[PDB]
Amino acid sequence: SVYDAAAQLTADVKKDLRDSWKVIGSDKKGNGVALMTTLFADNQETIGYFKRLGDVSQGMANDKLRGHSITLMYALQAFIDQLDNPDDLVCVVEKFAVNHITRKISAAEFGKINGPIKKVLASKNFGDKYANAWAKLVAVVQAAL
Amino acid sequence: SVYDAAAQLTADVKKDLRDSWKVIGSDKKGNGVALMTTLFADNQETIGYFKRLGDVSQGMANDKLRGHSITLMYALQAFIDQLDNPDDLVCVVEKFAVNHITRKISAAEFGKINGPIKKVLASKNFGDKYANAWAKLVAVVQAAL
Numbered sequence: 001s002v003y004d005a006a007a008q009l010t011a012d013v014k015k016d017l018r019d020s021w022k023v024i025g026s027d028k029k030g031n032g033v034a035l036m037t038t039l040f041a042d043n044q045e046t047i048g049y050f051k052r053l054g055d056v057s058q059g060m061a062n063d064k065l066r067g068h069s070i071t072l073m074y075a076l077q078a079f080i081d082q083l084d085n086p087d088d089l090v091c092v093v094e095k096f097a098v099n100h101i102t103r104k105i106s107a108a109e110f111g112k113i114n115g116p117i118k119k120v121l122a123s124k125n126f127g128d129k130y131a132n133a134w135a136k137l138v139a140v141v142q143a144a145l
Numbered sequence: 146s147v148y149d150a151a152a153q154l155t156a157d158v159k160k161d162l163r164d165s166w167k168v169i170g171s172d173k174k175g176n177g178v179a180l181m182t183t184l185f186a187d188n189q190e191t192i193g194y195f196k197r198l199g200d201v202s203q204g205m206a207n208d209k210l211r212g213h214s215i216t217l218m219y220a221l222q223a224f225i226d227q228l229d230n231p232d233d234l235v236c237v238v239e240k241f242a243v244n245h246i247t248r249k250i251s252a253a254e255f256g257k258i259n260g261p262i263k264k265v266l267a268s269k270n271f272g273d274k275y276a277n278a279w280a281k282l283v284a285v286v287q288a289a290l
Protein backbone atom coordinates (compact mmCIF):
# COMPACT_ATOMS: atom_id res chain seq x y z
CA SER A 1 0.00 0.00 0.00
CA VAL A 2 1.43 3.34 -1.12
CA TYR A 3 -0.57 5.04 1.62
CA ASP A 4 0.95 2.86 4.34
CA ALA A 5 4.38 3.43 2.80
CA ALA A 6 3.85 7.20 2.87
CA ALA A 7 2.92 6.90 6.55
CA GLN A 8 6.44 5.60 7.22
CA LEU A 9 7.82 9.06 6.47
CA THR A 10 8.10 10.28 10.06
CA ALA A 11 9.17 13.74 11.22
CA ASP A 12 12.79 12.58 11.57
CA VAL A 13 12.82 10.92 8.15
CA LYS A 14 11.35 14.00 6.47
CA LYS A 15 13.97 16.18 8.15
CA ASP A 16 16.86 14.00 6.98
CA LEU A 17 15.48 14.00 3.44
CA ARG A 18 15.20 17.80 3.38
CA ASP A 19 18.64 18.39 4.88
CA SER A 20 20.42 16.05 2.49
CA TRP A 21 18.44 17.29 -0.51
CA LYS A 22 19.59 20.83 0.19
CA VAL A 23 23.05 19.57 -0.78
CA ILE A 24 22.45 16.95 -3.48
CA GLY A 25 19.72 18.99 -5.16
CA SER A 26 22.05 21.98 -5.57
CA ASP A 27 23.73 20.39 -8.60
CA LYS A 28 21.03 18.52 -10.50
CA LYS A 29 23.08 18.01 -13.67
CA GLY A 30 26.20 16.79 -11.88
CA ASN A 31 24.56 14.55 -9.29
CA GLY A 32 21.83 13.44 -11.67
CA VAL A 33 24.36 12.06 -14.15
CA ALA A 34 26.41 10.65 -11.27
CA LEU A 35 23.37 8.67 -10.09
CA MET A 36 22.70 7.25 -13.55
CA THR A 37 26.31 6.37 -14.37
CA THR A 38 26.63 4.61 -11.01
CA LEU A 39 23.45 2.64 -11.69
CA PHE A 40 24.83 1.48 -15.04
CA ALA A 41 28.23 0.62 -13.58
CA ASP A 42 26.98 -1.43 -10.62
CA ASN A 43 23.92 -2.89 -12.36
CA GLN A 44 24.93 -3.36 -15.99
CA GLU A 45 21.88 -5.57 -16.54
CA THR A 46 19.64 -2.49 -16.41
CA ILE A 47 21.30 -0.74 -19.36
CA GLY A 48 19.04 -2.49 -21.87
CA TYR A 49 16.02 -0.59 -20.54
CA PHE A 50 17.60 2.72 -21.56
CA LYS A 51 17.96 2.01 -25.29
CA ARG A 52 16.51 5.43 -26.20
CA LEU A 53 19.43 7.24 -24.55
CA GLY A 54 22.00 5.69 -26.87
CA ASP A 55 25.53 5.00 -25.62
CA VAL A 56 25.25 5.71 -21.89
CA SER A 57 28.96 5.02 -21.32
CA GLN A 58 29.58 8.50 -22.73
CA GLY A 59 28.09 10.00 -19.58
CA MET A 60 27.94 13.79 -19.48
CA ALA A 61 28.86 13.96 -23.19
CA ASN A 62 25.58 12.22 -24.03
CA ASP A 63 22.93 14.90 -24.60
CA LYS A 64 20.00 12.51 -24.13
CA LEU A 65 21.45 11.08 -20.93
CA ARG A 66 22.07 14.57 -19.56
CA GLY A 67 18.52 15.70 -20.32
CA HIS A 68 17.13 12.55 -18.72
CA SER A 69 19.31 12.91 -15.62
CA ILE A 70 18.35 16.53 -15.02
CA THR A 71 14.68 15.64 -15.42
CA LEU A 72 15.04 12.77 -12.95
CA MET A 73 16.33 15.21 -10.32
CA TYR A 74 13.22 17.35 -10.78
CA ALA A 75 11.09 14.30 -10.03
CA LEU A 76 12.96 13.91 -6.74
CA GLN A 77 12.47 17.65 -6.16
CA ALA A 78 8.73 17.11 -6.64
CA PHE A 79 8.75 14.38 -3.97
CA ILE A 80 10.55 16.55 -1.42
CA ASP A 81 8.22 19.50 -2.03
CA GLN A 82 5.19 17.27 -1.36
CA LEU A 83 6.34 15.85 1.98
CA ASP A 84 3.94 18.06 3.96
CA ASN A 85 0.82 16.62 2.30
CA PRO A 86 0.67 12.81 1.92
CA ASP A 87 -2.28 12.93 -0.48
CA ASP A 88 -0.32 15.11 -2.90
CA LEU A 89 2.86 13.10 -2.45
CA VAL A 90 0.92 9.98 -3.37
CA CYS A 91 -0.57 11.37 -6.58
CA VAL A 92 2.85 12.58 -7.74
CA VAL A 93 4.45 9.22 -6.94
CA GLU A 94 1.73 7.34 -8.83
CA LYS A 95 2.28 9.61 -11.85
CA PHE A 96 5.95 8.63 -12.06
CA ALA A 97 5.15 5.05 -11.15
CA VAL A 98 3.08 4.79 -14.33
CA ASN A 99 6.10 5.96 -16.33
CA HIS A 100 7.94 2.88 -15.09
CA ILE A 101 5.11 0.37 -15.14
CA THR A 102 4.77 0.97 -18.89
CA ARG A 103 8.52 0.31 -19.15
CA LYS A 104 8.08 -3.04 -17.38
CA ILE A 105 10.10 -1.98 -14.32
CA SER A 106 9.28 -3.98 -11.19
CA ALA A 107 9.51 -2.88 -7.56
CA ALA A 108 12.62 -5.02 -7.12
CA GLU A 109 14.45 -3.50 -10.08
CA PHE A 110 13.40 0.04 -9.17
CA GLY A 111 14.98 -0.58 -5.78
CA LYS A 112 18.36 -0.99 -7.48
CA ILE A 113 18.61 2.81 -7.30
CA ASN A 114 19.27 2.56 -3.55
CA GLY A 115 22.88 1.56 -4.14
CA PRO A 116 23.67 4.59 -6.35
CA ILE A 117 21.86 6.96 -3.97
CA LYS A 118 23.88 5.68 -1.01
CA LYS A 119 27.10 6.14 -2.99
CA VAL A 120 26.25 9.66 -4.17
CA LEU A 121 25.26 10.64 -0.63
CA ALA A 122 28.47 9.18 0.81
CA SER A 123 30.58 11.17 -1.65
CA LYS A 124 29.01 14.27 -0.09
CA ASN A 125 29.66 13.07 3.47
CA PHE A 126 26.11 11.86 4.19
CA GLY A 127 26.16 8.39 5.74
CA ASP A 128 23.89 5.39 6.25
CA LYS A 129 21.45 7.49 8.28
CA TYR A 130 20.57 9.52 5.20
CA ALA A 131 20.75 6.55 2.83
CA ASN A 132 18.11 4.79 4.92
CA ALA A 133 15.88 7.87 4.89
CA TRP A 134 16.03 7.93 1.10
CA ALA A 135 15.35 4.20 0.95
CA LYS A 136 12.03 4.86 2.69
CA LEU A 137 11.10 7.48 0.11
CA VAL A 138 12.03 5.09 -2.69
CA ALA A 139 9.87 2.50 -0.92
CA VAL A 140 6.83 4.70 -1.52
CA VAL A 141 7.40 4.46 -5.28
CA GLN A 142 8.01 0.72 -5.05
CA ALA A 143 4.64 0.27 -3.35
CA ALA A 144 2.99 1.71 -6.46
CA LEU A 145 4.76 -0.55 -8.96
CA SER B 146 17.15 24.80 -34.63
CA VAL B 147 16.09 24.47 -30.99
CA TYR B 148 19.48 25.85 -29.98
CA ASP B 149 18.88 28.97 -32.09
CA ALA B 150 15.44 29.49 -30.56
CA ALA B 151 16.94 29.22 -27.07
CA ALA B 152 20.04 31.31 -27.73
CA GLN B 153 17.76 34.15 -28.85
CA LEU B 154 16.08 34.50 -25.45
CA THR B 155 17.25 37.95 -24.34
CA ALA B 156 18.13 39.22 -20.87
CA ASP B 157 14.89 41.20 -20.67
CA VAL B 158 12.81 38.16 -21.62
CA LYS B 159 14.61 35.97 -19.10
CA LYS B 160 13.95 38.62 -16.45
CA ASP B 161 10.21 38.70 -17.20
CA LEU B 162 10.05 34.89 -17.17
CA ARG B 163 11.83 34.67 -13.82
CA ASP B 164 9.82 37.44 -12.19
CA SER B 165 6.49 35.94 -13.22
CA TRP B 166 7.57 32.39 -12.34
CA LYS B 167 8.44 33.52 -8.81
CA VAL B 168 4.71 34.01 -8.41
CA ILE B 169 3.02 31.44 -10.65
CA GLY B 170 5.52 28.78 -9.69
CA SER B 171 4.97 29.33 -5.96
CA ASP B 172 1.67 27.42 -6.05
CA LYS B 173 2.31 24.55 -8.43
CA LYS B 174 -0.76 22.54 -7.44
CA GLY B 175 -3.15 25.48 -7.69
CA ASN B 176 -1.81 27.09 -10.86
CA GLY B 177 -1.00 23.78 -12.50
CA VAL B 178 -4.58 22.58 -12.21
CA ALA B 179 -5.82 26.01 -13.31
CA LEU B 180 -3.70 25.76 -16.46
CA MET B 181 -5.03 22.32 -17.34
CA THR B 182 -8.67 23.12 -16.61
CA THR B 183 -8.43 26.31 -18.66
CA LEU B 184 -7.01 24.31 -21.57
CA PHE B 185 -9.94 21.88 -21.45
CA ALA B 186 -12.44 24.71 -21.11
CA ASP B 187 -11.22 26.74 -24.09
CA ASN B 188 -9.97 23.87 -26.24
CA GLN B 189 -12.42 21.02 -25.69
CA GLU B 190 -10.96 19.18 -28.68
CA THR B 191 -7.89 18.33 -26.57
CA ILE B 192 -9.78 16.44 -23.86
CA GLY B 193 -9.55 13.15 -25.74
CA TYR B 194 -5.74 13.21 -25.58
CA PHE B 195 -5.88 12.95 -21.78
CA LYS B 196 -8.01 9.81 -21.40
CA ARG B 197 -5.47 8.31 -18.97
CA LEU B 198 -6.44 11.01 -16.48
CA GLY B 199 -10.09 9.93 -16.40
CA ASP B 200 -12.82 12.54 -15.83
CA VAL B 201 -10.90 15.83 -16.00
CA SER B 202 -14.06 17.78 -15.15
CA GLN B 203 -13.48 16.63 -11.57
CA GLY B 204 -10.66 19.16 -11.28
CA MET B 205 -8.63 19.15 -8.06
CA ALA B 206 -10.56 16.11 -6.81
CA ASN B 207 -9.16 13.98 -9.65
CA ASP B 208 -5.90 12.63 -8.23
CA LYS B 209 -4.53 11.68 -11.65
CA LEU B 210 -5.18 15.19 -12.96
CA ARG B 211 -3.67 16.69 -9.82
CA GLY B 212 -0.56 14.52 -10.13
CA HIS B 213 -0.18 15.38 -13.81
CA SER B 214 -0.70 19.10 -13.20
CA ILE B 215 1.88 19.28 -10.42
CA THR B 216 4.46 17.39 -12.50
CA LEU B 217 3.82 19.69 -15.47
CA MET B 218 4.80 22.67 -13.33
CA TYR B 219 8.12 20.99 -12.56
CA ALA B 220 8.85 20.69 -16.27
CA LEU B 221 8.39 24.45 -16.44
CA GLN B 222 10.58 24.76 -13.35
CA ALA B 223 13.28 22.85 -15.21
CA PHE B 224 13.04 25.27 -18.15
CA ILE B 225 13.29 28.37 -15.95
CA ASP B 226 16.27 27.01 -14.01
CA GLN B 227 18.22 26.38 -17.23
CA LEU B 228 17.67 29.79 -18.87
CA ASP B 229 21.32 30.88 -18.57
CA ASN B 230 22.76 27.79 -20.27
CA PRO B 231 21.22 27.12 -23.72
CA ASP B 232 23.05 23.79 -23.93
CA ASP B 233 21.22 22.48 -20.86
CA LEU B 234 17.92 24.16 -21.75
CA VAL B 235 18.02 22.39 -25.11
CA CYS B 236 18.56 18.86 -23.80
CA VAL B 237 15.75 19.30 -21.28
CA VAL B 238 13.42 20.75 -23.90
CA GLU B 239 14.17 17.87 -26.27
CA LYS B 240 13.43 15.37 -23.50
CA PHE B 241 9.93 16.75 -22.93
CA ALA B 242 9.46 17.17 -26.68
CA VAL B 243 9.81 13.42 -27.14
CA ASN B 244 7.06 12.90 -24.55
CA HIS B 245 4.72 14.83 -26.83
CA ILE B 246 6.04 13.58 -30.16
CA THR B 247 5.11 10.06 -29.08
CA ARG B 248 1.56 11.28 -28.43
CA LYS B 249 1.44 12.82 -31.90
CA ILE B 250 1.21 16.39 -30.57
CA SER B 251 2.13 18.90 -33.28
CA ALA B 252 3.96 22.20 -32.84
CA ALA B 253 0.71 24.03 -33.59
CA GLU B 254 -1.24 21.97 -31.05
CA PHE B 255 1.41 22.49 -28.38
CA GLY B 256 0.95 26.22 -28.96
CA LYS B 257 -2.61 25.95 -27.67
CA ILE B 258 -1.11 26.25 -24.18
CA ASN B 259 -0.41 29.95 -24.79
CA GLY B 260 -4.03 30.90 -24.19
CA PRO B 261 -4.24 29.25 -20.74
CA ILE B 262 -0.81 30.61 -19.76
CA LYS B 263 -1.96 34.11 -20.68
CA LYS B 264 -5.08 33.77 -18.54
CA VAL B 265 -3.24 32.34 -15.53
CA LEU B 266 -0.68 35.14 -15.76
CA ALA B 267 -3.51 37.67 -15.93
CA SER B 268 -5.05 36.26 -12.75
CA LYS B 269 -1.88 37.39 -10.98
CA ASN B 270 -1.81 40.72 -12.83
CA PHE B 271 0.97 39.90 -15.27
CA GLY B 272 0.09 41.59 -18.56
CA ASP B 273 0.76 41.04 -22.26
CA LYS B 274 4.49 41.74 -21.88
CA TYR B 275 4.77 38.64 -19.71
CA ALA B 276 2.44 36.59 -21.91
CA ASN B 277 4.70 37.44 -24.84
CA ALA B 278 7.78 36.31 -22.90
CA TRP B 279 6.17 32.96 -22.14
CA ALA B 280 5.13 32.52 -25.76
CA LYS B 281 8.81 32.81 -26.66
CA LEU B 282 9.71 30.04 -24.23
CA VAL B 283 6.91 27.85 -25.59
CA ALA B 284 8.31 28.57 -29.05
CA VAL B 285 11.57 26.90 -28.01
CA VAL B 286 9.66 23.68 -27.44
CA GLN B 287 7.79 24.16 -30.71
CA ALA B 288 11.14 24.27 -32.52
CA ALA B 289 11.61 20.67 -31.37
CA LEU B 290 8.21 19.45 -32.57
Ligand code: HEM
Nearest residue numbers: 046049050052071072075076099103105109110112113244
Ligand atom coordinates in the same frame (compact mmCIF):
# COMPACT_ATOMS: atom_id res chain seq x y z
C1 HEM C 1 15.17 7.55 -7.77
C2 HEM C 1 14.40 6.74 -8.66
C3 HEM C 1 13.99 7.08 -9.94
C4 HEM C 1 13.28 8.18 -10.34
C5 HEM C 1 12.76 9.30 -9.45
C6 HEM C 1 13.01 8.03 -11.76
C7 HEM C 1 12.43 9.02 -12.57
C8 HEM C 1 12.22 8.88 -13.96
C9 HEM C 1 11.64 9.89 -14.82
C10 HEM C 1 11.10 11.24 -14.37
C11 HEM C 1 11.62 9.38 -16.08
C12 HEM C 1 11.05 9.98 -17.35
C13 HEM C 1 9.63 9.51 -17.59
C14 HEM C 1 9.20 9.69 -19.03
O1 HEM C 1 9.31 10.83 -19.54
O2 HEM C 1 8.73 8.71 -19.65
C15 HEM C 1 12.19 8.06 -16.03
C16 HEM C 1 12.33 7.22 -17.14
C17 HEM C 1 12.79 5.90 -17.08
N1 HEM C 1 13.15 5.25 -15.91
FE1 HEM C 1 13.29 6.02 -14.05
N2 HEM C 1 13.49 6.80 -12.22
C18 HEM C 1 14.11 6.23 -11.12
C19 HEM C 1 14.72 4.96 -11.11
C20 HEM C 1 14.69 4.06 -12.18
C21 HEM C 1 15.30 2.73 -12.14
C22 HEM C 1 16.06 2.13 -10.96
C23 HEM C 1 15.08 2.15 -13.36
C24 HEM C 1 15.54 0.90 -13.84
C25 HEM C 1 15.93 -0.28 -13.06
C26 HEM C 1 14.34 3.13 -14.14
C27 HEM C 1 13.99 2.96 -15.48
C28 HEM C 1 13.47 3.95 -16.32
C29 HEM C 1 13.34 3.81 -17.76
C30 HEM C 1 13.61 2.57 -18.62
C31 HEM C 1 12.92 5.01 -18.23
C32 HEM C 1 12.67 5.37 -19.69
C33 HEM C 1 13.81 6.20 -20.27
C34 HEM C 1 13.52 6.68 -21.68
O3 HEM C 1 13.38 5.84 -22.59
O4 HEM C 1 13.42 7.91 -21.87
N3 HEM C 1 14.13 4.32 -13.42
N4 HEM C 1 12.53 7.76 -14.72
Ligand code: HEM
Nearest residue numbers: 099191194195197216217220221244248250254255257258
Ligand atom coordinates in the same frame (compact mmCIF):
# COMPACT_ATOMS: atom_id res chain seq x y z
C1 HEM D 1 3.66 24.41 -21.12
C2 HEM D 1 3.44 23.30 -22.00
C3 HEM D 1 3.42 21.96 -21.64
C4 HEM D 1 4.29 21.29 -20.82
C5 HEM D 1 5.49 21.89 -20.08
C6 HEM D 1 3.90 19.90 -20.84
C7 HEM D 1 4.46 18.91 -20.02
C8 HEM D 1 4.04 17.58 -19.96
C9 HEM D 1 4.61 16.55 -19.09
C10 HEM D 1 5.71 16.73 -18.06
C11 HEM D 1 3.95 15.39 -19.38
C12 HEM D 1 4.21 13.98 -18.84
C13 HEM D 1 5.06 13.15 -19.79
C14 HEM D 1 4.93 11.66 -19.53
O1 HEM D 1 4.93 11.26 -18.35
O2 HEM D 1 4.82 10.90 -20.51
C15 HEM D 1 2.96 15.70 -20.38
C16 HEM D 1 2.09 14.76 -20.94
C17 HEM D 1 1.17 15.00 -21.96
N1 HEM D 1 1.01 16.24 -22.58
FE1 HEM D 1 1.91 17.97 -22.15
N2 HEM D 1 2.81 19.71 -21.69
C18 HEM D 1 2.50 20.97 -22.18
C19 HEM D 1 1.50 21.25 -23.14
C20 HEM D 1 0.67 20.29 -23.75
C21 HEM D 1 -0.36 20.56 -24.72
C22 HEM D 1 -0.76 21.97 -25.16
C23 HEM D 1 -0.91 19.36 -25.10
C24 HEM D 1 -1.92 19.06 -26.03
C25 HEM D 1 -2.75 19.99 -26.75
C26 HEM D 1 -0.20 18.34 -24.33
C27 HEM D 1 -0.48 16.97 -24.40
C28 HEM D 1 0.06 16.00 -23.57
C29 HEM D 1 -0.41 14.62 -23.51
C30 HEM D 1 -1.51 13.99 -24.36
C31 HEM D 1 0.26 14.01 -22.52
C32 HEM D 1 0.03 12.59 -22.01
C33 HEM D 1 -0.78 12.57 -20.72
C34 HEM D 1 -0.87 11.18 -20.12
O3 HEM D 1 -1.49 10.30 -20.74
O4 HEM D 1 -0.32 10.98 -19.02
N3 HEM D 1 0.74 18.92 -23.50
N4 HEM D 1 3.03 17.04 -20.75
